[PDB]
């Protein structure tokens, strides 16, 4: 009966806010049937085991010739609860709605896939600042440690610890910059989110290859010296594609700032020396692969900060662009999202 009840409560969902509906439906079924078992069937152990087995067969209900949607749905539910948004929930509300969530989580029986998905979402919510409360992230990491073993929340807790200990690293880096021989010029405001390889799901895979711009090579050098002197025996590999930097467009009117990724930032360097820059004239400095350069150029053309001097808007060998001096943005904080 419980099994069929699950198939009348969770299988009828049609897209929309499925993460907040699947978990809520399973929790409603569980709450109805554990109340019924406790007050009618004397809370018998066999019936509670039957409830747990039926919900186990209900939660990860695998459609034939398909993967079960339960791990991704539960990961997205946790993501939506923890991510800061205009839903107006408080810390108490999200703490309650995650403690009740664990009841659904124990029936997944495919915990590795949920671990991968939760790591993928936690990486984004910790890097891009989408987390609502860091204490909420700690509470959710600790709850999964109480549900299943520590080896489950090893990488997750290490990611949380890495993102927590970043202000202290930045403070120590600034202290080193001040007390490192002469006063090194701080032409940039360099805050670093150092991460542990193997913990974070991020893979560098530098087959694309990249060259750091000249005005950022000094910061790379001084941070390399800081992280080789203060800490020892640690290969600091650079994860380039997640590095973002802001630029104010004083070249034309000085109307706004232009927060943009480093890969798209390296486009602007060659355009700084000369307004008209070709595809290879841009590529000789960045020294990156054609795919990432084409993607960044297409994204900037959507931004339309650079206007294509060549009539053929599609990317080709020549692909000469210039600074669109007529281009302007409505806001004074024109952030470029990816």
């Amino acid at each position: 009966h419980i099994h069929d009840e699950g198939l009348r409560a969770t299988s009828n969902l049609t897209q929309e806010n499925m993460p907040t509906l699947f978990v809520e439906s399973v929790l409603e079924v569980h709450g109805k049937f554990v109340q019924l078992i406790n007050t009618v069937l004397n809370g018998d152990q066999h019936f509670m085991s039957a409830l747990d087995k039926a919900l186990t067969s209900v939660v990860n209900y695998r459609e034939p010739k398909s993967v079960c949607k339960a791990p991704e749905l539960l990961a997205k539910y946790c993501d939506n609860l923890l991510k800061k948004s205009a839903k107006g929930m408080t810390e108490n509300e999200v703490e309650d709605r995650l403690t009740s969530f664990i009841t659904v989580f124990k029936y997944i029986d495919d915990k590795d896939v949920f671990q991968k998905f939760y790591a993928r979402m936690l990486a984004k919510r910790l890097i891009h600042g989408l987390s609502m409360s860091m204490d909420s992230e700690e509470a959710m990491i600790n709850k999964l440690k109480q549900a299943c073993g520590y080896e489950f929340t090893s990488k997750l807790h290490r990611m949380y610890t890495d993102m927590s200990v970043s202000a202290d690293l930045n403070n120590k880096f600034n202290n080193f910059i001040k007390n490192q021989d002469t006063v090194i010029d701080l032409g940039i405001s360099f805050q670093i989110y150092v991460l542990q390889a193997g913990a974070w799901p991020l893979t560098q895979a530098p087959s694309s290859t990249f060259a750091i711009p000249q005005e950022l090579e000094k910061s790379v050098q001084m941070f390399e010296l800081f992280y080789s002197q203060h800490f020892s025996g640690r290969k600091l590999t650079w994860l380039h594609y997640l590095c973002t930097g802001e630029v104010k467009m004083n070249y034309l009117g000085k109307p706004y700032v232009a927060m943009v990724t480093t890969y798209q930032m390296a486009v602007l360097l060659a355009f700084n020396n000369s307004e008209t820059v070709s595809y290879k004239e841009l590529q000789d400095s960045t020294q990156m692969n054609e795919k990432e350069l084409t993607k960044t150029i297409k994204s900037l053309l959507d931004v339309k900060m650079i206007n294509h001097d060549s009539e053929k808007e599609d990317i080709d060998a020549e692909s000469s662009f210039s600074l669109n001096m007529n281009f302007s943005s409505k806001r004074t904080k024109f952030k470029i999202t990816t």
Partner: protein, 83 residues
């Protein structure tokens, strides 16, 4: 049109593949089991990493507690000396 604020993200490895405090069976970069409890009193920084000549890594508290009675490295039964 120049760069003035930059956010950077960089991974790091230990230069030697070590993934667990073999005494505690939790990761060395995490807090030790002794410091896992009474976390309010712990400052979450005292859990430093101790390296031996055998290129094995444990928390300082863990290898210190193990060394108070047994002078031998827990993993490979040879003498232990800090780096």
């Amino acid at each position: 049109f120049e760069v003035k604020k930059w956010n950077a993200v960089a991974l790091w490895a230990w230069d030697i593949v070590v993934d667990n405090c073999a005494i505690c069976r939790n990761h060395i970069m995490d807090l030790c089991i002794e410091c896992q409890a009474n976390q309010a009193s712990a400052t979450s920084e005292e859990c430093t990493v101790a390296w031996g000549v055998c290129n094995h890594a444990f928390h300082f508290h863990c290898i210190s507690r193990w060394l108070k009675t047994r002078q031998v490295c827990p993993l490979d039964n040879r003498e232990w000396e800090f780096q």
